[PDB]
């Protein structure tokens, strides 16, 4: 039984991943678009992200979690959908996208 | 006047809510003042008087 928690959202252009934990960082339940049998372009849709945070939150509340914080990441479109649905699963809502200070060289641009 | 890196209260006025140095087109400072401002803020960040990223 844990009541205070943190919800991590990792939304990219290929997949949305949600991990729920306390403030101590130890996870309790996670889901993703792939865990719901979505493949490819389906795995990145904003609708398909909400089906993942809803699944994740229901498992964390089963442990007894009521208040969870939000840490969002990535430019994936499944950001509002995965965050609003956090408040839509009986969870009380009380940006961590890594930016470098000019560090490592990024890969070459794609000539599609 | 010469800007001191110890004067954190004056410096905080020119940083943003994430600790970023504010552009001079926003604060209205002149070019030479903004250069002195930038050196003092970077000095003060090193001495932990001001944050890098909050």
């Amino acid at each position: 039984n844990i009541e205070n928690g943190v919800a991590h959202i990792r939304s990219t252009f290929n997949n949305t991943i949600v991990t729920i934990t306390d403030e101590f960082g130890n996870a309790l339940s996670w889901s993703s678009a792939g865990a719901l049998g979505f493949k490819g372009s389906k795995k990145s849709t904003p609708f398909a992200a909400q089906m993942a945070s809803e699944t994740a939150s229901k498992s964390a509340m089963e442990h007894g979690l009521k208040t969870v914080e939000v840490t969002v990441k990535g430019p994936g479109p499944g950001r509002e959908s995965a965050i609003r649905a956090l408040q839509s699963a009986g969870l009380e809502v009380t940006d961590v996208t890594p930016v470098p200070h000019n560090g490592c060289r990024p890969p070459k641009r794609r000539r599609v | 006047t010469h800007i001191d890196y110890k004067d954190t209260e004056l410096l905080k006025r020119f940083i943003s809510e994430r600790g970023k140095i504010l552009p001079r087109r926003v604060t209205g400072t002149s070019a030479k003042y903004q250069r002195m401002l930038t050196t003092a803020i970077k000095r003060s960040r090193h001495m932990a008087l001001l944050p890098y990223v909050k």
Partner: protein, 154 residues
């Protein structure tokens, strides 16, 4: 068309059941402008329905049509190298069109000898949530919910 929408034509209610939906059904039945044959089939089918079911033919026919009319459809779309079947909501006037079209089309494929027999059995079947026209609606929803992720296209 490119310019815009075109006004639609009203129809008269049928003389027996005072129903515009019944008139539209006769037009779907009708081939080559032969309206008398289409009316004869429709009214004979409704007599078969009323006695094989025990209820009013019109009341059974509205139940049957409600089980054929779809709420969601799929639309073809070209999206940069991948055709996507976008699910859309069927407008109320198109719902009646598809309900009547599927009812007649799948009554024509049945094995009863006369069309009045085939139409009456399709209506009785669709009023029990079975038959070819109800299955066709089910497969349309089954194609749509398999693409409800693609609702974000237009």
């Amino acid at each position: 068309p490119r310019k815009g929408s075109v006004p639609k034509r009203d129809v008269l209610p049928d003389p027996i059941h005072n129903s515009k939906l019944v008139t539209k059904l006769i037009n779907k039945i009708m081939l080559d402008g032969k309206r008398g044959t289409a009316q004869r089939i429709l009214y004979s089918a409704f007599d078969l329905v009323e006695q094989r079911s025990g209820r009013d033919a019109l009341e059974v026919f509205e139940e049957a049509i409600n089980n054929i009319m779809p709420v969601l459809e799929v639309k073809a779309r070209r999206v940069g190298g991948s055709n996507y079947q976008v699910p859309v909501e069927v407008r109320p006037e198109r719902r009646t069109t598809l309900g009547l079209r599927w009812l007649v089309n799948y009554a024509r494929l049945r094995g009863e000898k006369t069309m009045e027999d085939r139409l009456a059995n399709e209506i009785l079947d669709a009023a029990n949530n079975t038959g070819g026209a109800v299955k066709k609606r089910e497969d349309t929803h089954k194609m749509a919910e398999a693409n409800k992720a693609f609702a974000h296209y237009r």
